Amino acid sequence: GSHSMRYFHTSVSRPGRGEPRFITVGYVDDTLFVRFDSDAASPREEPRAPWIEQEGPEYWDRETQICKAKAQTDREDLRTLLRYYNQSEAGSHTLQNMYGCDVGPDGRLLRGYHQDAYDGKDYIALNEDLSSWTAADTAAQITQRKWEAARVAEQLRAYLEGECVEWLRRYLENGKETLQRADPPKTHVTHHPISDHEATLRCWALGFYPAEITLTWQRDGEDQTQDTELVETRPAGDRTFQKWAAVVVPSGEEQRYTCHVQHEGLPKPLTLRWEP
């Protein structure tokens, strides 16, 4: 189907405790494949998926150089942002960046991204045109002016439409065993008495990849959204994900409730009921 490649970056200042820590990770879809941490003993970008291990020494050297240089520019950026926000040097602050591409089944660019956040808030984002910017505030407009002057968007567009897309195609081929395999959810319903008057029904989805899934409960065919406890999809640690959805069911109503499961690894959505 469609696919994505994303790089995530976080720098966190720590005044009086050395220089900001820089951590970046790369994903294809929901698969982590590279990481770099400036607090490592010998910081290098390191593989995290089997299909990237075959890249040769020039790849790792180049990627490591890019990471180290971004750690440095982020430290300069944290200093600039203290100025732009009139902040003191005393506190810890955070700078986040994400960029990458989404492609369709034919490998063509669907959308590119490049966006930043400061202290957990949107700061500046490249728009979907890959040519203009959305600045969150008057500080980010100062950045936008500089990036317009320097034609930064054009350099990002060139990467996002070219290299980004081409790397993702390469990775999807080299990783075709796993990146191009959906693992469907393993599903079941459990029953948990609460009192004489009610019990929880919990609908489980386990072992699935990728992470996107829809789990819902209906009663007499009506969605129970407001009355469903839906936990965040969570990693199992074996590449796969888990999720559950629970409803509080009055005594004797169990067969009126149905759980519905949608996932790309399922040829047809599933319907499940409690089976005593």
Partner: peptide
């Protein structure tokens, strides 16, 4: 593979 263009805010 990563973007190589240095960018400062």
């Amino acid at each position: 593979g990563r973007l190589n263009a240095p960018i400062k805010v």
